[PDB]
Design a protein around this nucleic acid. Sequence first.
RNA 1: GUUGGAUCUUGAGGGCCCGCCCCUCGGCGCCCCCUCGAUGUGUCCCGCGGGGCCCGAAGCGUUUACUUUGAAAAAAUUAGA
Lengths: 190, 84, 82, 208, 129, 150
Amino acid sequence: SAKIVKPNGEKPDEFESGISQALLELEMNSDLKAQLRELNITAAKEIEVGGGRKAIIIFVPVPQLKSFQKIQVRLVRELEKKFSGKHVVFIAQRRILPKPTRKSRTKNKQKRPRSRTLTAVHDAILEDLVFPSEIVGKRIRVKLDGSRLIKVHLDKAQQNNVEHKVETFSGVYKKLTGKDVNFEFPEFQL
Amino acid sequence: MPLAKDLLHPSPEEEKRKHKKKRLVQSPNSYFMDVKCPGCYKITTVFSHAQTVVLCVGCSTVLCQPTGGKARLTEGCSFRRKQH
Amino acid sequence: MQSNAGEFVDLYVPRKCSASNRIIGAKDHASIPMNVAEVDKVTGRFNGQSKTYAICGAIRRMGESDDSILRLAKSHGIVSQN
Amino acid sequence: SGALDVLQMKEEDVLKFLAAGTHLGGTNLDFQMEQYIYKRKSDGIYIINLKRTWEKLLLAARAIVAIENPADVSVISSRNTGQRAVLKFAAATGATPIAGRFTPGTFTNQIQAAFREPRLLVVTDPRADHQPLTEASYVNLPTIALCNTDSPLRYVDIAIPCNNKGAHSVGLMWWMLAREVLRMRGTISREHPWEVMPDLYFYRDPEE
Amino acid sequence: VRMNVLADALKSINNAEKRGKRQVLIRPCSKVIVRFLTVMMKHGYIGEFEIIDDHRAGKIVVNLTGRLNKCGVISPRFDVQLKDLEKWQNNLLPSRQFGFIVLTTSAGIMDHEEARRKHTGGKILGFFF
Amino acid sequence: GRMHAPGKGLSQSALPYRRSVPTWLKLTSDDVKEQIYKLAKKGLTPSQIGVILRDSHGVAQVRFVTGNKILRILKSKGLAPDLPEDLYHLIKKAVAVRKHLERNRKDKDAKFRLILIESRIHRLARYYKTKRVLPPNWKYESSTASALVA
RNA sequence: GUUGGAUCUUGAGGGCCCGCCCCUCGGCGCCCCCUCGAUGUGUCCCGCGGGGCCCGAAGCGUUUACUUUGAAAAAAUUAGA
């Protein structure tokens, strides 16, 4: 029952009203029944991207995500059809552990590994962008201006589902961190 | 070389000829293969540099001949990593 | 090498190179320009001004100058089959 | 470039590269000539890239072209296979031919039997013409050298890969480099190839 | 092992500029290595650099320019209370007209110029000119 | 840097950059650990378990399958080798020289290597005494060498 | 002895500058109290007054080295008006 999709204390409506009404239909959808009946997303976010489309960011604390990640190619494309071209993405959201510093208060820390740091969660977003292509390697191109354009070396197979979403996935992570991302299929297994 | 080159993306032969821990991107090329030998009635996943026997129950005692390098095969088979 | 804004201290400006980003100095031997004629653009009968490229002896004594002007005459043009 | 079409190798050239055997090279590992190698034969004999031959055949000619004199272009052939060729190069281009020994000191040596004032040197083999290449390096002289896959490359400016040793690969390039300059500056103008065959060229082969 | 991850990298790039080489494979890639690379990138001694992400320790390929003459390390490091900084500009920099000394200071890794502008030192890293 | 060993070569493998290995058949935690717990019942070292996890199964390692490694799984199980398995083979190396030294009072090679092997033990085992892996009150001994191997 | 691998997050003002991002004080609040504007042993604009508690803030949260701030740092000396 998509009833935590729209409520997270969140002011969305229409798209979270849509995604919940989508997910209820996705619950009522065959092959998509009984994996979304219990797994209802915690929050949704609709931003625009460099591909001119809107990007449904779907928030998952990842007990949810592993079935959302599991399909993600019909499930997005159905909602891309259901919401008229919108490149939906299923973005992980943890309770990201705070800065290791002093004041700018550091209320309680119990253990912060690199399994729970913020740069861990940024890279978890990058994986949840690309479900067909797996990040083989990464090359951050630190420009002479000081700018940095990461070259995400993806799987060179299953690459084409990413290619119409690259313009989205560059547009999404731009709005997330104030920083672009670039995706490559460079020479792996070739 | 004329000692002035920069290869941000070099040819994939000069890293691929190196040792697996001597690469520009140190990721091995040792891999899994799926054995089509008729000694078993099944297709069994075997690592390349397996170092050991890998057998089955559809076979009794041969699926592969072991090898500390890339593993010895019997009657010819297929092979797929897949995606390393 | 200059001083304060409009005032020039040095006796001259020594030449440079584009292959090692390194200067060509005072009396340096095998430290030469390379004047390659602008030949024109199927109409033919080469057009005057040679493309210049300064080469030092250091890239010459290290044997670099063959690919260096190949990084200067192919890369900048103009050359047929490139 | 000039007339770009015949400056992108014609089959008349392509056959002559095969006829003079220029595409072949030695068996030795390079680090400056391996770019100019197309492929290698079984257990190693290097097929050079005739693209790298022609594109250096153009530009090294273009270094000679727009020098208003071939007199300050001293072309060098200690190999007897190119001594007819530099005779027929100086017949065609008008450059200064150097046959045989350099006689160490024509570029140094105030008190000497000779003194030359070139601007660019053209060399059959920089190992066979290292004594030019020494006094090229002494008095700031750039030097074109025909280099095979075993040639030296120190102090060597723009290098045309050829087999350029023994065979008519020598006299073809002097046929071709005198072609390229008369292609640029001459009566074989507007980037037209020659009507003169490399039989006015290739070396004497003592006759009957 | 690599006791100094900078001095093993500075011997690389100095020998690279000795060869005129425009690429290096440096490792084990501390962030302290990276912050020195970013500053000298701003000063135009070098060009840009591109890190290749490895899970061993990561490696960087650096495109450099031939504008540098000497980059050295203070091995082992020392503390600078902004009063020794001029003597390193005396004994170790060729003039007081050019030459930059980089320091880790508690307002971040910076040059000697922002170190004098903020007046808060730290530990000395090295130099480049 | 190898003062523990005279080698200069390689004994260690390369590992790929991806944590999703092999991403064509990722046999689950239950696939690997029930194999592991049977192999922990069979009592192999993780060096031996991870080989037979690699080549026989469709997966390579459990650090790609799970977050834990085998000894980490064995620690989280609690059924784990009570000394480090690499250190166990280190102690195994010394007993084999010592018994051979107990055989040959003339093998001067066995007299020199048993120093360095135990010196490689005494620099390794000391570290595990510190971080509550070995008990620090315990100390390596030629008496305790054959005791741990047997 | 002496040295040692990687690795955890912070936009506006004006042509840099600011705080931010992924309780003991002050103090937005709360009630108590002399109550302040509805009300003049006392409310409901709120502790601003003391607070009390809990916030942005802060004992915060693992700390130092380090650096920086000052104090302190005989006179003479010495630098030097």
